[PDB]
Each structure stands twice: as C-alpha cells, then as structure tokens.
C-alpha cells in the first residue's frame, strides 16, 4: 500500500515484548505510534488503581494520536502490549509535515479516531442502559465482528477471558463466568477459558 | 481566521429552532455540519426512550463528522438544538476536496474528535468504576465547581432537577431521589426539590 509504505518510511520502528507499557497516562504527548505487528490494550484506572480495558488495538492501528492537534496535551490512557509488537514511531512535529505533503495520511488517522469515537460512545450507552447480561452479550457480539475474529464451521471464534470481559463491562470475572454459563445453556456460545465461540 | 472563513464560504447556511433535531441516529451520513451560532445536545437513547447526554456542542464545533471517512455509515447519535442554531452544511464529497487543498481544515475537525474521544472515554471509566451513588456524588462535586454554582454560607448551591441528574448518571429520577436523600442523611449535602447544597 503506497500511502502507508511512504508513511512508514518516515518513522523508526521498534520491538517491544509482551506486557511492555508503550504509553503512560499523564505523560507529555509528543510522539505518534503505529502498530506494524501485534496487539495492545488501552487501559484506564480507578482511584484505587484498578484497571479497565477501554479498547484493544491491532496491526494497522495508530496509537498516541490524541495529543497531535493541540499543544501540551497529556496521554489520556495507558497502552500496554498484549503480544510482542513492532511499533513505528514519529514525532508529532514530523507527522505534521507529512500531513502537509499528503493529507491522505491524516484521513487514515482520522478515520480510526472516528471509529473509536463511535465505539466508545456505544460503550457509554451499554454501560448506562444495559444490565450485566446485556453488556456481556454486546461485548461478545462486538469482539466477534472484529477483523481478528476467526471463522469456524459453527460460528466466530474470539480470544478473550472472563477477567478481560469483566474489565470491559464493569463486573467481576466470577459474574462473567456465571453469565457465560447461561449463554451456553441457551445454545448461543461455547465458552472455554481463553476462547469463546459465538454460534452462527 | 482565514481557514475557517474559507471553509464557510463553501457551505450552505441554515437555521434550526430550539428543540428541533438536526441529526437522527441511524440516518445515512453524507453531510458535515459546523455550528456558526447556538448550541446543541448530542444524545443517545434506550429502546424505551431513556436519554443520556454525550456532549453539548457550541459555536465553532463540527457535527456529523463521524461518517466522513468511510461511505455508507449511519449517524451515531441524535443531535438536538438546545438553542436556536445557525449551522453550515457541506457534503462529505465536497469537504474531501477542501481537505486536499488545505488540510488545516481537517486538523481543526480532528482536534475536536480527539477532545471528544478523551471526554467520552472518561465517561466510560466513570460508568464502569462507580455505582450510581458514586456517579451522583461525583456529578454534584463537579457541578459545585462550575460558575453557576452559588456560594452560600452552608456550601455551594446548585439548581438542577432529578431529571437532569438522571440523564447524566444513567438512572431514573426516582433513583436520583433515593441517593440524594442518602447523601443528605450522611450530612454531605442538603437536597430538596431542585435545590442542592454541597457541603
Ligand atoms: N476510547 C479509546 N479507544 C481507543 N483508543 C483510545 C481510546 N482512548 C485512548 N486511546 C488511545 O490511547 C492513547 C493514549 O495516549 P494518547 O491520549 O496520546 O492517544 C490515545 C489513543 O491512541
Ligand atoms: N461521544 C460524542 N461526543 C461528542 N459528539 C458526538 C459523540 N458521539 C457522536 N457525536 C456527534 O453526534 C453526531 C451524530 O452524527 P455522526 O455520527 O455523523 O457524527 C456525530 C458527532 O458529530
Ligand atoms: N438506566 C436508566 N434508568 C432510567 N433512566 C435513565 C437511565 N439512564 C438514563 N436515564 C435517563 O435519566 C432520566 C432521569 O429522569 P427520568 O427517570 O424522568 O428519565 C430518565 C432517563 O431519560
């Protein structure tokens, strides 16, 4: 792809092991990142430091974009490598140069920002309006329609744990496991420890 | 500034009265808006019509931007006029030509998307981390720090209805009543009718 190849030619790319923290909330934002390979979680915390997963991001996703457009912003969340990752980086200052050369690279970034706003808005509604079963059900549907979901003969395979679902919907891992058992009994899913199949 | 004035010169300007809906969730998105004057509320809804305010947007804000970057999308929320509004409107197709001539106009729009993502993400953490009591406590603390809060001898007085609290925190007006009474019992606020005093 020529636009993304040109862009990456102006970055420097680095390897990070699984569980590396790429971005820390509250740091000064001066750098944009782009996932060449691997997956990350975007995390926020409560007052006791307890984590919740705000999003997962994958190969082809920009990260660290939110301070690009205004001076002196701070990182809004933590970003942690869930797998080993290969991440391109570029300063905000150089990226702003690229945008004046070819605004298509800003369109590619902004498209992802717009998607994230859509997804995060929907999460506000799920948290505001739905009971725990309904939040879990939506979370499974959403994971199943991700590009990384694998098609099986009986449905979509997703890679997630009860603790991760809990950290998405705001309940305990035990509560998630009870609800997954209900959804299994209803013949809607098959739930293992690290994998769930959503039947279809 | 010259970028904004250049942009507006390519738009069709129109007026909405207070309480009108500018954008309905689920409609096909083909047009970008920009608020020249007035203010709007961005909301989402229950199946049962329960509402939650995602944001207020004001003069200078783009609206209807989320469908710009891929064809075939639907509007993600309702946008309703909180006051009479004058709004500039441009097709996505035309606006994409503008971006190529001067991408500063996209920087302006993407700057607002970034702020909205930060604000909405904070709302997700509040909803997920806090029970309805904690959400109300925190909403009252926040309102007490706003300019419309009235400093009194006993603390900061706010004027807000149970209804209005519910469409911030995600609970019904009756639930709001119960929590406020509990908080009062704990000698943290006084709460009666639409008048709250935060000690
Ligand atoms: N709601 C969200 N959805 C997806 N990614 C997010 C969200 N909130 C923050 N991030 C990412 O987490 C990064 C933290 O650093 P920045 O705020 O610079 O840029 C942020 C985004 O890349
Ligand atoms: N979380 C949010 N914060 C502020 N504005 C929003 C949010 N979600 C949706 N919008 C606005 O509401 C509009 C509804 O139509 P669009 O999805 O085209 O574009 C959307 C944005 O302009
Ligand atoms: N989960 C919820 N339960 C009830 N009302 C809600 C919820 N989330 C948002 N709301 C809105 O908050 C409002 C509070 O006042 P009402 O109960 O009259 O109407 C309510 C709804 O419009």
Residue numbers in the entry:
A (entry chain B): 9 to 208
B (entry chain A): 9 to 207
Question: What does the literature reporting this entry say, word for word?
Answer:
CAP is a 210-amino-acid transcription factor that binds cAMP generated by adenylyl cyclase in response to the phosphorylated form of Enzyme IIAGlc (phosphorylated in response to the phosphoenolpyruvate-carbohydrate phosphotransferase system). cAMP-bound CAP regulates the transcription of over 100 genes crucial for carbon utilization through its binding to a specific promoter region and recruitment of RNA polymerase. Previous studies of the ligand binding domain of CAP demonstrated negative cooperativity between cAMP binding sites in the absence of structural change within this domain. We produce coarse-grained models that describe global low-frequency protein backbone motions of CAP and show a strong correlation between negative cooperativity for cAMP and modulation of the delocalised normal modes on ligand binding without a requirement for a spatially distinct physical pathway or conformational change. We demonstrate experimentally that altered connectivity between backbone elements in CAP can give predictable alterations to cooperativity for cAMP binding through altered mode amplitudes.
We examined amino acids predicted to show altered (V132, H160) or neutral (V140) responses to altered amino acid side chain interactions. The ENM calculations predicted a reduction in the negative cooperativity of CAP in response to a reduction in the strength of the local interactions of residue H160. In particular, H160 was predicted to form interactions that contribute to allostery with D162 and Q165. The mutation H160L was predicted to break these interactions while maintaining side chain bulk; this was confirmed by X-ray crystallography of the H160L CAP protein. No overall change in H160L protein structure was evident compared to wild-type. ITC experiments demonstrated that cooperativity for cAMP became less negative as predicted by computation. This crucial experiment demonstrates that altering low-frequency motions at a site distant from both the ligand binding site as well as the dimer interface, and from any presumed physical pathway of structural change connecting these sites, can nonetheless give predictable effects on cooperativity.
